[PDB]
C-alpha cells in the first residue's frame, strides 16, 4: 500500500471521502458518514500495522542452542518499509 507509486490508493481513499464531503450536511445520509468512517478506518489500518511478536512453546525445556532469532518478517519486507 505504501510503496505502490508512493501510495496512490491514499489519494483514492480521500477522493472517496470528498465524494461524501461535497454533499451538504443536511443532505448527507448516514451511509455517507459511514463511508467517511470507512476512509478514516482505512488510514488507521495503514498506520496501525506493525511487525508481529515471536511466540514460543514453553512446555518443553529450552535446549542448549536457545533462541537464534525473533525476526518475524516476510522476504521482500524490510524494517524500513514498515
Amino acid at each position: 500500500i505504501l510503496s505502490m507509486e508512493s501510495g496512490k490508493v491514499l489519494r483514492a481513499a480521500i477522493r472517496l471521502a470528498l465524494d461524501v464531503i461535497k454533499i451538504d450536511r443536511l443532505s448527507r445520509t448516514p451511509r455517507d458518514n459511514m463511508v467517511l468512517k470507512l476512509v478514516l478506518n482505512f488510514f488507521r489500518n495503514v498506520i496501525a500495522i506493525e511487525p508481529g511478536e515471536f511466540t514460543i512453546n514453553t512446555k518443553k525445556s529450552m535446549p542448549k542452542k536457545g533462541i537464534t532469532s525473533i525476526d518475524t518478517l516476510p522476504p521482500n519486507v524490510s524494517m524500513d518499509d514498515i
Binding site: 480521500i14 470528498l18 464531503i21 461535497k22
Partner: peptide, 20 residues
C-alpha cells in the same frame, strides 16, 4: 488557525492540475 474544507478541495484540484 481554522482549516477550510473548500481550501482543501481547491488545493486537491490545483495539485491535480500541476502538482508544483
Amino acid at each position: 488557525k481554522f482549516f477550510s474544507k473548500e481550501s482543501f478541495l481547491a488545493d486537491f484540484d490545483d495539485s491535480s492540475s500541476n502538482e508544483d
